[PDB]
Design a protein around this ligand. Structure first.
Ligand SMILES: Cc1ccc2c(C(=O)O)c[nH]c2c1
Length: 168
């Protein structure tokens, strides 16, 4: 049903909210929730861990089965799997891990995957353990994505910095 509420317009197609993406997916019933995935689809922490836990491990069983056919994803790549109870689809997207020397230029390729979907509920890619600057990631999102993306940012302090950087 894509019932997004309380999102701040940043640009004509990019919205942002200070919110837990798992609680957002349960209220919104989005067509697509984006996962911040790794190449092996092992959902052991962060957004990936949170989404998988909310599916009581359904997501992780489908993920393996996909890996069995494909082997690992490529950095900047993605796959469309079931959203289970959270969404119609989950778009598993791998951004570069700059801690491991993966190139920040691949963050554009990662966001390009969003353009295959009319409307997404998403985190910022390559943030957290992936080591990119979240404000940089928001700029790449705004520059690259032309479809409608509703970004959920868990941390109030980071949310306020993002909105300060974008609108002041
Ligand atoms: C959890 C869930 C399941 C299905 C859908 C859907 C659809 O089937 O069109 C749109 N949002 C959804 C959300």
């Amino acid at each position: 049903v894509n019932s997004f509420s309380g999102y701040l317009k940043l640009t004509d197609n990019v919205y942002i909210k200070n919110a837990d993406i798992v609680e957002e997916a349960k209220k919104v019933k989005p067509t697509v929730v984006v996962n911040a995935a790794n190449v092996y689809l092992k959902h052991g922490g962060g957004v990936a861990g949170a989404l998988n836990k909310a599916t009581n491990n359904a997501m992780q069983v489908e993920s393996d089965d996909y890996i069995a056919t494909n082997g690992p994803l490529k950095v900047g790549g993605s796959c469309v799997l079931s959203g289970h109870n959270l969404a119609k689809h989950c778009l598993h997207v791998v951004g570069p891990n700059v801690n491991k020397g993966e190139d920040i230029q691949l963050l554009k390729s990662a966001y390009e995957n969003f353009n295959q979907h009319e409307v997404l509920l998403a985190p910022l890619l390559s943030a957290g353990i992936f080591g990119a600057d979240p404000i940089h990631s928001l700029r790449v999102c705004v520059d690259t994505v032309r479809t409608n993306v509703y970004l959920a940012v868990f941390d109030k302090n980071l949310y306020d910095k993002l909105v300060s950087s974008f609108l002041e």
